[PDB]
Design a protein around this ligand. Sequence first.
Ligand SMILES: OC[C@H]1O[C@@H](O)[C@H](O)[C@@H](O)[C@H]1O
Length: 140
Amino acid sequence: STQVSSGQTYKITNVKAGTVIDLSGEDNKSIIGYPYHSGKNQQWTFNWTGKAWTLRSASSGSYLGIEGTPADGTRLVAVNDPFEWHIWRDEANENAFRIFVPFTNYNLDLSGYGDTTPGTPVQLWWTWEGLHQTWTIDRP
Ligand SMILES: OC[C@H]1O[C@@H](O)[C@H](O)[C@@H](O)[C@H]1O
């Protein structure tokens, strides 16, 4: 297994689609599912703040975050300030994780029920059993 460790850098792979969380090279802002090609924009440095994880783009130094109120369909975006996440192991595949906005029922969701199309947005969605809401955190 791969330990998630503060100060280490990982790729984050959708269990259903097999694409990774990718900071779009089109705008350096939008967070999308894209096939892994060892891009620095596909690599995220994890830091434990004492209470939560922050995920920093290896390419841009922006953090993985959101803007405005968590809801179904809230887009993930690059943000300037560290944004705190909580991770919980999944029930269907216990080597995988669900990644939540703290104190909410909203977790990362690869949109369109895990569409494999490159560029598919990564968003928040209310937690439910679909495997497109589950992610492995892997060595780059
Ligand atoms: O169109 C989006 C794509 O842009 C490319 O430049 C980048 O290498 C990919 O990882 C992906 O972000």
